[PDB]
C-alpha cells in the first residue's frame, strides 16, 4: 500500500506536446532521438479520465498528485544523483506515460516506456486501485486533429504536418495565380469551376481535398510544394 | 534488464506502418482499443513485406485471414478518436523485438510482428493463425527460407 517505484527507466522526452499521438511509442523511436535514463521514478495508477487529461493536454495537474511525487524521482546528472521536482509515471492499466514537469505544474515533458518496462508496469498495477486525486472536469493547421493523422507512421505525420505548414504559408501569400496552380496540381479537373473563385475559396477547396488521409499523391505533392523554401526543404531532408 | 539488449530505432518503416494501420483497422471496426486482431488485420492490409509472402507461401490470402478474424470479434460503438494499444497488443510488439534478437536480426520487420502475434498465444490473432493451421515453427521456417 506504499508508493510504487520504478528504477532505471528509459525515456524519450517530447516537450510541449498537447496531443498524445506526438508522444511517440517505443516502436516509433529513432536512433537520432536522445534517450535518457531515470534512476528512480514513482508510479501512479489513476482512472482513465485523469490519464487522458494528462496525456492529451497541457493543463494543471491535480495538487495532490504533485505533492505525492514531489522530489521522489532521481536522475544521475554529471556523476551526481539529483532530485527532480515533479517527475512520475502514470497509467490507467491501459495507457502508460512518463512525465517531467521540469518545475511547471503541467506535464511539459512526456514519454512512453520501452515494451519490457510497460509489461512490468502492467504486472505492478495488476492489483492496484486507482487514485482519484480529486480530479473533476482546439485543433488547427499547425496542430492536426487526431482524425487527420490516423493510420500514419511518425514519418508520415511529420511530412504531412510539413505539407500543411507549406499550405499555411501559401495562404498568407494571397497570390491567386499561385494557389490556382497548386490546386490544379491536386485536382486538374476543376479548371472551369475555380476560375470565378477568389484566392480564399480556392485555398479552402485545396485544404478540404488534402486534409483527409495520406497517399503517394500527398507525398509527391508535398515534395513539389516545398521546393524553393530552404526551411521546408531542410525539414524534408531530415525525414527522408 | 541488460542495456546491451536494449536497442531503439530498429523498427522498419513498413513495420511501423503495420502498427499504424492497426489503429485504423480498430477504428474501422469501431473498437475502443487496438488488440492483437487489429495488428493482424494491419499486417495483411500492408501485404508487401516478408510476413505477407510467408503467409501466402502457407496458402493464406488476406481475404481468408480477414474473415477468420471477423468470425471471432464483433463491432464496437466507440467514438473516441484517441485510442490505445491493449496490454497484450503491446506484448506482441515486445515479443517481436525478442524474436528479432534471437534470430540475430538488427531490425524489426513485419516478419517479426507475424511471429510476435503467434508467440503472444492468448489473443485473437494467435487463435486465427492457429485456426488456419500455421504453427510458430512453420511460420519460422517460412520466414527464414524467404530471407
Ligand atoms: Mg519490414
CSV table of C-alpha atoms and ligand atoms in Angstrom, one decimal:
chain,number,residue,atom,x,y,z
A,1,UNK,CA,0.0,0.0,0.0
A,2,UNK,CA,3.1,2.2,-0.2
A,3,UNK,CA,4.2,4.2,-3.2
A,4,UNK,CA,5.2,2.2,-6.2
A,5,UNK,CA,8.6,3.0,-7.7
A,6,UNK,CA,10.3,2.1,-11.0
A,7,UNK,CA,14.1,2.1,-11.4
A,8,UNK,CA,16.3,2.5,-14.5
A,9,UNK,CA,13.5,3.7,-16.8
A,10,UNK,CA,14.5,4.7,-20.3
A,11,UNK,CA,12.5,7.7,-21.6
A,12,UNK,CA,12.4,9.6,-24.8
A,13,UNK,CA,11.0,13.0,-23.9
A,14,UNK,CA,8.7,15.0,-26.1
A,15,UNK,CA,8.4,18.6,-24.9
A,16,UNK,CA,5.2,20.7,-25.0
A,17,UNK,CA,3.0,18.1,-26.8
A,18,UNK,CA,-0.7,18.8,-26.4
A,19,UNK,CA,-1.6,15.7,-28.4
A,20,UNK,CA,-0.8,12.3,-27.2
A,21,UNK,CA,-0.1,11.0,-30.7
A,22,UNK,CA,3.1,13.2,-30.7
A,23,UNK,CA,4.4,11.4,-27.6
A,24,UNK,CA,5.8,8.6,-29.8
A,25,UNK,CA,5.6,5.0,-28.7
A,26,UNK,CA,8.8,2.9,-28.5
A,27,UNK,CA,8.5,1.3,-31.9
A,28,UNK,CA,8.5,4.9,-33.4
A,29,UNK,CA,11.7,5.9,-31.6
A,30,UNK,CA,14.7,6.8,-33.8
A,31,UNK,CA,18.4,6.2,-33.3
A,32,UNK,CA,18.7,10.0,-33.6
A,33,UNK,CA,16.4,10.6,-30.6
A,34,UNK,CA,18.3,11.4,-27.4
A,35,UNK,CA,17.1,8.7,-25.0
A,36,UNK,CA,17.6,9.3,-21.3
A,37,UNK,CA,17.5,7.3,-18.1
A,38,UNK,CA,15.6,7.8,-14.9
A,39,UNK,CA,17.4,6.3,-11.8
A,40,UNK,CA,14.1,6.1,-9.8
A,41,UNK,CA,10.6,7.3,-10.6
A,42,UNK,CA,7.3,6.9,-8.8
A,43,UNK,CA,4.5,5.0,-10.5
A,44,UNK,CA,0.8,6.1,-10.1
A,45,UNK,CA,-2.4,4.4,-11.2
A,46,UNK,CA,-5.3,6.8,-12.0
A,47,UNK,CA,-8.7,6.3,-13.7
A,48,UNK,CA,-8.9,6.7,-17.4
A,49,UNK,CA,-10.4,10.2,-17.4
A,50,UNK,CA,-7.5,11.6,-15.4
A,51,UNK,CA,-4.9,9.7,-17.5
A,52,UNK,CA,-6.4,11.1,-20.7
A,53,UNK,CA,-6.4,14.6,-19.2
A,54,UNK,CA,-2.6,14.3,-18.6
A,55,UNK,CA,-1.8,12.5,-21.8
A,56,UNK,CA,-3.8,14.6,-24.3
A,57,UNK,CA,-3.4,18.1,-22.8
A,58,UNK,CA,-1.0,20.6,-21.2
A,59,UNK,CA,-3.2,21.7,-18.2
A,60,UNK,CA,-2.6,21.9,-14.5
A,61,UNK,CA,-2.1,18.6,-12.7
A,62,UNK,CA,-4.0,17.8,-9.5
A,63,UNK,CA,-2.3,19.4,-6.5
A,64,UNK,CA,-2.4,16.1,-4.6
A,65,UNK,CA,-0.6,14.3,-7.4
A,66,UNK,CA,2.2,16.9,-7.5
A,67,UNK,CA,2.8,16.8,-3.7
A,68,UNK,CA,2.7,13.0,-3.9
A,69,UNK,CA,5.5,12.9,-6.4
A,70,UNK,CA,7.4,16.0,-5.2
A,71,UNK,CA,11.2,15.2,-5.2
A,72,UNK,CA,10.6,11.5,-5.3
A,73,UNK,CA,12.3,10.8,-8.6
A,74,UNK,CA,16.1,10.9,-9.1
A,75,UNK,CA,18.4,11.2,-12.1
A,76,UNK,CA,22.2,10.9,-12.3
A,77,UNK,CA,23.3,14.2,-13.7
A,78,UNK,CA,27.1,14.7,-14.0
A,79,UNK,CA,28.1,11.8,-11.8
A,80,UNK,CA,25.7,13.1,-9.0
A,81,UNK,CA,22.4,11.7,-8.0
A,82,UNK,CA,19.9,14.6,-8.5
A,83,UNK,CA,16.4,15.2,-7.3
A,84,UNK,CA,13.7,16.0,-9.9
A,85,UNK,CA,10.9,18.3,-8.8
A,86,UNK,CA,7.9,16.6,-10.4
A,87,UNK,CA,8.6,13.5,-12.5
A,88,UNK,CA,6.4,10.4,-12.5
A,89,UNK,CA,5.0,7.5,-14.5
A,90,UNK,CA,1.2,7.3,-14.7
A,91,UNK,CA,-1.1,4.6,-16.0
A,92,UNK,CA,-4.8,3.6,-16.1
A,93,UNK,CA,-3.9,-0.1,-16.7
A,94,UNK,CA,-4.0,0.5,-20.5
A,95,UNK,CA,-2.0,3.6,-21.4
A,96,UNK,CA,1.3,4.4,-19.8
A,97,UNK,CA,3.0,7.8,-19.7
A,98,UNK,CA,6.2,9.2,-18.1
A,99,UNK,CA,6.0,12.9,-17.2
A,100,UNK,CA,8.5,15.5,-16.2
A,101,UNK,CA,7.0,18.9,-15.5
A,102,UNK,CA,10.6,20.4,-15.3
A,103,UNK,CA,9.2,22.5,-12.5
A,104,UNK,CA,5.9,23.5,-14.0
A,105,UNK,CA,2.5,22.3,-12.8
A,106,UNK,CA,1.7,21.0,-16.2
A,107,UNK,CA,3.1,17.9,-18.0
A,108,UNK,CA,5.6,19.8,-20.1
A,109,UNK,CA,7.7,16.7,-20.9
A,110,UNK,CA,6.1,13.4,-21.8
A,111,UNK,CA,7.5,10.0,-22.8
A,112,UNK,CA,6.3,6.4,-23.5
A,113,UNK,CA,8.1,3.5,-21.9
A,114,UNK,CA,10.0,0.7,-23.6
A,115,UNK,CA,7.9,-2.5,-24.0
A,116,UNK,CA,9.5,-4.6,-21.3
A,117,UNK,CA,9.0,-1.9,-18.8
A,118,UNK,CA,5.4,-1.3,-19.9
A,119,UNK,CA,4.8,-5.0,-19.1
A,120,UNK,CA,6.5,-4.5,-15.8
A,121,UNK,CA,4.1,-1.6,-15.1
A,122,UNK,CA,1.1,-3.8,-16.0
A,123,UNK,CA,2.2,-6.5,-13.6
A,124,UNK,CA,2.9,-4.0,-10.9
A,125,UNK,CA,-0.5,-2.3,-11.2
A,126,UNK,CA,-2.5,-5.6,-11.5
A,127,UNK,CA,-4.0,-5.5,-8.0
A,128,UNK,CA,-3.8,-1.7,-7.5
A,129,UNK,CA,-6.8,0.5,-7.0
A,130,UNK,CA,-6.8,3.8,-9.0
A,131,UNK,CA,-6.1,7.1,-7.2
A,132,UNK,CA,-8.6,9.9,-7.9
A,133,UNK,CA,-6.6,13.0,-6.7
A,134,UNK,CA,-10.0,14.8,-6.6
A,135,UNK,CA,-10.0,15.4,-10.3
A,136,UNK,CA,-13.2,16.6,-11.9
A,137,UNK,CA,-13.7,18.0,-15.5
A,138,UNK,CA,-8.5,23.1,-30.0
A,139,UNK,CA,-7.1,21.8,-33.3
A,140,UNK,CA,-5.7,23.9,-36.2
A,141,UNK,CA,-3.4,23.7,-39.3
A,142,UNK,CA,-0.2,23.7,-37.1
A,143,UNK,CA,-1.7,21.2,-34.7
A,144,UNK,CA,-3.6,18.5,-36.5
A,145,UNK,CA,-6.6,16.7,-35.1
A,146,UNK,CA,-6.1,13.0,-34.4
A,147,UNK,CA,-8.5,12.0,-37.1
A,148,UNK,CA,-6.1,13.6,-39.7
A,149,UNK,CA,-3.1,11.7,-38.5
A,150,UNK,CA,-4.9,8.4,-38.0
A,151,UNK,CA,-3.1,5.4,-39.5
A,152,UNK,CA,0.2,7.3,-40.2
A,153,UNK,CA,3.7,6.5,-39.0
A,154,UNK,CA,5.8,9.1,-37.2
A,155,UNK,CA,7.5,9.8,-40.5
A,156,UNK,CA,4.2,10.4,-42.4
A,157,UNK,CA,2.8,12.5,-39.6
A,158,UNK,CA,5.9,14.8,-39.8
A,159,UNK,CA,5.8,15.0,-43.6
A,160,UNK,CA,2.0,15.7,-43.5
A,161,UNK,CA,2.4,18.5,-40.9
A,162,UNK,CA,5.2,20.0,-43.1
A,163,UNK,CA,2.9,19.9,-46.1
A,164,UNK,CA,0.2,21.9,-44.2
A,165,UNK,CA,2.9,24.2,-42.9
A,166,UNK,CA,3.7,25.0,-46.5
A,167,UNK,CA,0.0,25.3,-47.3
A,168,UNK,CA,-0.4,27.7,-44.4
A,169,UNK,CA,2.4,29.8,-45.7
A,170,UNK,CA,0.7,29.7,-49.2
A,171,UNK,CA,-2.4,31.2,-47.6
A,172,UNK,CA,-0.5,34.3,-46.2
A,173,UNK,CA,1.0,35.0,-49.7
A,174,UNK,CA,-2.5,35.6,-51.1
A,175,UNK,CA,-1.4,35.1,-54.7
A,176,UNK,CA,-4.4,33.9,-56.7
A,177,UNK,CA,-2.2,32.6,-59.6
A,178,UNK,CA,-0.1,30.6,-57.2
A,179,UNK,CA,-3.0,28.9,-55.4
A,180,UNK,CA,-4.7,28.2,-58.7
A,181,UNK,CA,-1.5,26.4,-59.8
A,182,UNK,CA,-1.2,24.2,-56.7
A,183,UNK,CA,-4.9,23.3,-56.6
A,184,UNK,CA,-4.8,22.4,-60.2
A,185,UNK,CA,-1.8,20.2,-59.4
A,186,UNK,CA,-4.0,18.4,-56.9
A,187,UNK,CA,-7.3,18.5,-58.9
A,188,UNK,CA,-6.8,19.4,-62.5
A,189,UNK,CA,-10.4,18.6,-63.5
A,190,UNK,CA,-11.8,21.8,-61.7
A,191,UNK,CA,-10.3,24.2,-64.3
A,192,UNK,CA,-13.7,25.6,-65.3
A,193,UNK,CA,-15.2,25.9,-61.8
A,194,UNK,CA,-12.4,27.6,-59.9
A,195,UNK,CA,-11.9,30.5,-62.4
A,196,UNK,CA,-14.6,32.8,-60.9
A,197,UNK,CA,-13.3,31.9,-57.5
A,198,UNK,CA,-11.2,34.1,-55.2
A,199,UNK,CA,-7.9,33.1,-53.7
A,200,UNK,CA,-9.7,32.2,-50.4
A,201,UNK,CA,-12.3,30.0,-52.0
A,202,UNK,CA,-9.6,28.0,-53.9
A,203,UNK,CA,-7.3,27.6,-50.9
A,204,UNK,CA,-10.3,26.2,-48.9
A,205,UNK,CA,-11.0,23.6,-51.6
A,206,UNK,CA,-7.3,22.7,-51.7
A,207,UNK,CA,-7.2,22.3,-47.9
A,208,UNK,CA,-10.5,20.3,-47.8
A,209,UNK,CA,-9.4,17.9,-50.5
A,210,UNK,CA,-6.0,17.2,-48.9
A,211,UNK,CA,-6.6,17.2,-45.1
A,212,UNK,CA,-8.0,13.6,-45.0
A,213,UNK,CA,-5.6,10.7,-45.1
A,214,UNK,CA,-2.3,10.3,-46.8
A,215,UNK,CA,-1.0,8.8,-50.0
A,216,UNK,CA,1.8,8.7,-52.6
A,217,UNK,CA,-0.1,11.6,-54.2
A,218,UNK,CA,0.2,13.5,-51.0
A,219,UNK,CA,3.9,12.8,-50.7
A,220,UNK,CA,4.6,13.8,-54.2
A,221,UNK,CA,2.6,17.0,-53.9
A,222,UNK,CA,4.4,18.0,-50.7
A,223,UNK,CA,7.8,17.4,-52.3
A,224,UNK,CA,6.9,19.9,-55.1
A,225,UNK,CA,5.1,22.3,-52.9
A,226,UNK,CA,8.1,23.0,-50.6
A,227,UNK,CA,10.7,23.4,-53.4
A,228,UNK,CA,12.4,26.8,-53.2
A,229,UNK,CA,11.8,27.2,-49.4
A,230,UNK,CA,15.1,26.2,-47.7
A,231,UNK,CA,13.5,25.9,-44.3
A,232,UNK,CA,10.9,23.5,-45.6
A,233,UNK,CA,13.5,21.6,-47.7
A,234,UNK,CA,15.7,21.2,-44.6
A,235,UNK,CA,12.7,19.6,-42.7
A,236,UNK,CA,12.0,17.4,-45.7
A,237,UNK,CA,15.7,16.2,-45.9
A,238,UNK,CA,15.7,15.3,-42.2
A,239,UNK,CA,12.7,13.0,-42.7
A,240,UNK,CA,13.7,11.3,-46.0
B,1,UNK,CA,17.5,-5.7,-17.9
B,2,UNK,CA,20.8,-5.6,-19.7
B,3,UNK,CA,21.1,-2.4,-21.8
B,4,UNK,CA,23.2,-4.1,-24.4
B,5,UNK,CA,19.9,-5.9,-25.1
B,6,UNK,CA,18.0,-2.6,-25.2
B,7,UNK,CA,18.3,-1.1,-28.7
B,8,UNK,CA,15.9,1.5,-30.1
B,9,UNK,CA,15.1,2.9,-33.5
B,10,UNK,CA,15.1,-0.6,-35.1
B,11,UNK,CA,11.6,-1.0,-36.5
B,12,UNK,CA,11.5,-0.7,-40.2
B,13,UNK,CA,9.1,1.9,-41.7
B,14,UNK,CA,7.0,-0.9,-43.1
B,15,UNK,CA,6.8,-2.5,-39.7
B,16,UNK,CA,5.8,0.9,-38.2
B,17,UNK,CA,3.1,1.2,-40.9
B,18,UNK,CA,1.6,-2.1,-40.0
B,19,UNK,CA,1.4,-0.9,-36.4
B,20,UNK,CA,0.0,2.4,-37.6
B,21,UNK,CA,-2.5,0.7,-39.9
B,22,UNK,CA,-3.7,-1.3,-36.8
B,23,UNK,CA,-5.2,1.8,-35.2
B,24,UNK,CA,-7.1,2.4,-38.5
B,25,UNK,CA,-8.4,-1.2,-38.6
B,26,UNK,CA,-9.6,-0.9,-35.0
B,27,UNK,CA,-11.5,2.4,-35.5
B,28,UNK,CA,-12.9,0.9,-38.7
B,29,UNK,CA,-14.4,-1.9,-36.6
B,30,UNK,CA,-15.5,0.8,-34.1
B,31,UNK,CA,-13.3,-0.6,-31.3
B,32,UNK,CA,-12.1,1.2,-28.2
B,33,UNK,CA,-8.6,-0.3,-28.1
B,34,UNK,CA,-6.0,-1.8,-30.5
B,35,UNK,CA,-5.8,-5.6,-29.9
B,36,UNK,CA,-3.8,-8.4,-31.5
B,37,UNK,CA,-6.6,-8.9,-34.0
B,38,UNK,CA,-6.1,-5.3,-35.3
B,39,UNK,CA,-2.3,-5.9,-35.7
B,40,UNK,CA,-3.0,-9.0,-37.7
B,41,UNK,CA,-5.6,-7.0,-39.8
B,42,UNK,CA,-3.0,-4.3,-40.3
B,43,UNK,CA,-0.3,-6.9,-41.2
B,44,UNK,CA,-2.4,-8.4,-44.1
B,45,UNK,CA,-3.6,-4.9,-45.2
B,46,UNK,CA,0.1,-3.9,-45.8
B,47,UNK,CA,0.7,-7.1,-47.7
B,48,UNK,CA,4.1,-6.2,-49.2
B,49,UNK,CA,6.7,-7.5,-46.7
B,50,UNK,CA,8.2,-10.8,-45.7
B,51,UNK,CA,5.2,-11.6,-43.4
B,52,UNK,CA,2.7,-11.3,-46.3
B,53,UNK,CA,4.8,-13.6,-48.6
B,54,UNK,CA,5.3,-16.1,-45.8
B,55,UNK,CA,1.5,-16.2,-45.2
B,56,UNK,CA,1.0,-16.6,-49.0
B,57,UNK,CA,3.5,-19.4,-49.0
B,58,UNK,CA,1.4,-21.2,-46.5
B,59,UNK,CA,-1.7,-20.7,-48.7
B,60,UNK,CA,-3.3,-17.9,-46.6
B,61,UNK,CA,-4.5,-14.9,-48.5
B,62,UNK,CA,-5.6,-11.7,-46.9
B,63,UNK,CA,-9.3,-12.5,-47.7
B,64,UNK,CA,-9.3,-15.8,-45.7
B,65,UNK,CA,-7.4,-14.2,-42.8
B,66,UNK,CA,-9.8,-11.2,-42.6
B,67,UNK,CA,-12.9,-13.4,-42.4
B,68,UNK,CA,-11.5,-15.7,-39.8
B,69,UNK,CA,-10.7,-12.6,-37.7
B,70,UNK,CA,-14.1,-11.1,-38.3
B,71,UNK,CA,-15.6,-14.5,-37.3
B,72,UNK,CA,-14.1,-14.1,-33.8
B,73,UNK,CA,-14.7,-10.4,-33.0
B,74,UNK,CA,-17.6,-8.1,-33.1
B,75,UNK,CA,-18.1,-4.4,-34.0
B,76,UNK,CA,-17.9,-1.7,-31.3
B,77,UNK,CA,-19.6,1.6,-30.6
B,78,UNK,CA,-16.5,3.6,-29.6
B,79,UNK,CA,-16.3,7.1,-31.0
B,80,UNK,CA,-13.1,8.3,-29.2
B,81,UNK,CA,-10.6,9.4,-31.8
B,82,UNK,CA,-7.9,8.8,-29.2
B,83,UNK,CA,-7.3,5.0,-28.9
B,84,UNK,CA,-4.7,2.9,-27.2
B,85,UNK,CA,-2.9,-0.4,-27.6
B,86,UNK,CA,-4.2,-3.2,-25.3
B,87,UNK,CA,-1.6,-4.6,-22.9
B,88,UNK,CA,-1.5,-7.8,-25.0
B,89,UNK,CA,-1.1,-5.9,-28.2
B,90,UNK,CA,2.0,-4.3,-26.6
B,91,UNK,CA,3.1,-7.8,-25.7
B,92,UNK,CA,3.1,-8.6,-29.4
B,93,UNK,CA,5.4,-5.7,-30.0
B,94,UNK,CA,7.7,-6.8,-27.2
B,95,UNK,CA,7.8,-10.3,-28.5
B,96,UNK,CA,8.5,-9.0,-32.0
B,97,UNK,CA,11.8,-7.5,-30.6
B,98,UNK,CA,12.6,-10.6,-28.6
B,99,UNK,CA,12.2,-12.7,-31.7
B,100,UNK,CA,14.4,-10.4,-33.8
B,101,UNK,CA,17.1,-10.6,-31.1
B,102,UNK,CA,17.0,-14.4,-31.0
B,103,UNK,CA,17.1,-14.7,-34.8
B,104,UNK,CA,20.1,-12.4,-34.9
B,105,UNK,CA,18.5,-9.5,-36.8
B,106,UNK,CA,19.4,-5.9,-36.2
B,107,UNK,CA,16.0,-4.7,-37.4
B,108,UNK,CA,12.4,-5.4,-36.5
B,109,UNK,CA,10.4,-6.1,-39.7
B,110,UNK,CA,6.9,-7.3,-40.5
B,111,UNK,CA,8.1,-10.9,-40.3
B,112,UNK,CA,8.8,-10.4,-36.5
B,113,UNK,CA,5.4,-8.9,-35.9
B,114,UNK,CA,3.9,-12.1,-37.5
B,115,UNK,CA,6.0,-14.2,-35.2
B,116,UNK,CA,5.2,-12.0,-32.2
B,117,UNK,CA,1.5,-12.4,-33.0
B,118,UNK,CA,1.8,-16.2,-32.8
B,119,UNK,CA,4.0,-16.2,-29.7
B,120,UNK,CA,1.6,-13.9,-27.8
B,121,UNK,CA,-0.6,-17.0,-27.6
B,122,UNK,CA,-3.8,-15.9,-25.9
B,123,UNK,CA,-5.2,-13.2,-28.3
B,124,UNK,CA,-7.5,-13.4,-31.3
B,125,UNK,CA,-4.6,-13.1,-33.7
B,126,UNK,CA,-2.9,-16.2,-32.3
B,127,UNK,CA,-6.2,-18.0,-32.4
B,128,UNK,CA,-6.9,-17.0,-36.0
B,129,UNK,CA,-3.4,-18.1,-37.1
B,130,UNK,CA,-3.7,-21.4,-35.2
B,131,UNK,CA,-7.2,-21.8,-36.6
B,132,UNK,CA,-5.8,-21.5,-40.1
B,133,UNK,CA,-3.1,-24.1,-39.3
B,134,UNK,CA,0.1,-22.0,-39.2
B,135,UNK,CA,2.3,-23.1,-36.3
B,136,UNK,CA,5.1,-21.0,-34.8
B,137,UNK,CA,7.8,-23.3,-36.3
B,138,UNK,CA,6.2,-23.5,-39.8
B,139,UNK,CA,6.0,-19.7,-39.7
B,140,UNK,CA,9.6,-19.5,-38.6
B,141,UNK,CA,10.7,-22.0,-41.3
B,142,UNK,CA,8.9,-19.9,-43.9
B,143,UNK,CA,10.3,-16.6,-42.8
B,144,UNK,CA,13.9,-17.9,-42.6
B,145,UNK,CA,13.6,-19.5,-46.0
B,146,UNK,CA,12.4,-16.3,-47.5
B,147,UNK,CA,15.3,-14.3,-46.0
C,1,LIG,MG1,9.8,-4.9,-43.0
